[PDB]
């Protein structure tokens, strides 16, 4: 393991071979686990030299070594990635994509992935330099299965970074050019390719309805639903996120998710041991119950109300919070019959128990569900019958103490509930 000083010497020699030996030595240093001396290599002014070696077509070994060395530097902080880009590395790396040498092309893929992964500005700059055509050409084979596994995973991951951040989101024509290939990857058998593919789709669906639409039009929902029930957490997580983003769109878009059979997967998702899965499953449910009355009926038919009642009863506070939203949306847009069914499932007790929460936000969401529920009772003149259940559980108190509160909306609704159904 050479010293940075010696590496500088080798690179400064006008000896191609000496430069090769010094670059490899640089690569090995930047490969350590114990904090690679990235900042020193940068201050030493080596980046421009490395970028220069990327263009030495007659010495592929130094193309590889320097590509690798640059990749690890680009894998650092934004300041470090910026250094690589500032060195002119982008067009040099795109030129390597078409190298007859797979290991070199692969490093270029990897390098661009880290550059694009720094943020939207670098992501777009990489796109402006025309990285998309070359990248897509690499996956231009009839059956993905004939590609080396490790190589396919790298490309997938890099394409994923080209889909990622939101300020701004990737260029629309870039997304369109990418989608077809991305969809082939979403249908591939490698568990890692499947995971990153799902992350890419989850990014493309994090935005305006128009964004969700171009992904939905590619018929990916059914595959997403299938992945939604995979046995690997790494696949489930991004699939559920993508599903979650899609149900934030139009009711027509949400219906594609329900038609694909997504709801049958929620019994296990809403009881998943993984706190995060449970929380995003409930979130997804709250945007489904915010749909039409016929979609709320689908929630009911799949027997998901008891599951919502359960999560609201016992779960991480953040999961319970989404549950409240789900119930408030359900109570807000559902029929009288659907709301009655909700009460027969036992929503009152656990909903009351949450009024003690120390989070003003969940108290407003719940008092809202209570208003909604009473409003339904009113059409059944069974108001008084509910007004007792809420006393029973011991809610008449919490709504009572919620009069003498602090946040207006709260004691405004609290009080409004008292004088009208109780006192």
């Amino acid at each position: 393991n050479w010293s940075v000083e010696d590496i500088v010497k080798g690179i400064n020699s006008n000896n191609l071979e000496s430069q090769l030996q010094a670059t490899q030595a640089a690569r090995k240093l930047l490969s350590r686990e114990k904090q690679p001396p990235i900042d020193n290599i940068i201050r030493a002014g080596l980046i421009p030299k490395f970028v220069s070696f990327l263009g030495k077509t007659d010495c592929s070994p130094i193309q590889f070594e320097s590509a690798w060395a640059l990749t690890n530097i680009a894998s650092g902080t934004s300041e470090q990635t910026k250094a690589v880009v500032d060195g002119g590395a982008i067009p040099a790396f795109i030129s390597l994509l078409a190298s007859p040498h797979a290991h070199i092309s692969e490093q270029a893929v990897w390098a661009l992935g880290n550059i694009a992964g720094d943020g939207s500005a670098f992501r777009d700059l990489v796109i402006k330099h025309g990285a998309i055509d070359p990248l897509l050409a690499l996956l231009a084979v009839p059956d993905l299965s004939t590609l080396a596994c490790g190589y396919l995973r790298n490309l997938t991951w890099t394409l994923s970074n080209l889909c990622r951040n939101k300020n701004p989101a990737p260029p629309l024509d870039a997304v369109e050019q990418i989608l077809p290939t991305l969809v082939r990857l979403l249908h591939h058998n490698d568990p890692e390719v499947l995971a990153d593919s799902c992350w890419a789709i989850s990014y493309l669906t994090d935005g305006p309805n128009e964004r969700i639409e171009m992904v939905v039009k590619k018929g990916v929902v059914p595959q997403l639903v299938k992945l939604l029930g995979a046995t690997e957490l790494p696949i489930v997580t991004p699939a559920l996120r993508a599903i979650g983003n899609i149900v934030t769109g139009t009711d027509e878009q949400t219906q594609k998710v329900i038609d694909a059979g997504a709801l049958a997967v929620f019994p296990s998702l809403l009881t998943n041991p993984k706190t995060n899965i449970q929380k995003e499953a409930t979130w997804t449910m709250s945007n489904i119950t915010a749909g039409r009355q016929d979609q709320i009926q689908q929630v009911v038919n799949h027997g998901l109300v008891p599951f919502l009642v359960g999560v609201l009863s016992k779960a991480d506070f953040k999961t319970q919070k989404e549950a409240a939203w789900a119930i408030t949306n359900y109570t807000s847009g559902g029929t009288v019959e659907q709301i009655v069914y909700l009460v027969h499932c036992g929503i009152i007790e656990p909903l009351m128990n949450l009024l003690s929460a120390k989070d003003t936000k969940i108290i407003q969401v719940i008092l809202d569900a209570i208003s909604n529920i009473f409003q339904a009772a009113e059409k059944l003149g069974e108001t008084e019958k509910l007004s007792i259940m809420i006393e029973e559980c011991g809610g008449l108190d919490k709504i009572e103490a919620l009069q003498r509160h602090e946040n207006e909306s709260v004691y405004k609704a609290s009080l409004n509930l008292i004088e009208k159904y109780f006192s």
Binding site: K28, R32, W68, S75, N114, D118, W157
Partner: peptide
């Protein structure tokens, strides 16, 4: 987000 590589060596 970002990932570095490390092995080989000749």
């Amino acid at each position: 987000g970002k990932i570095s590589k490390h092995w080989t060596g000749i």
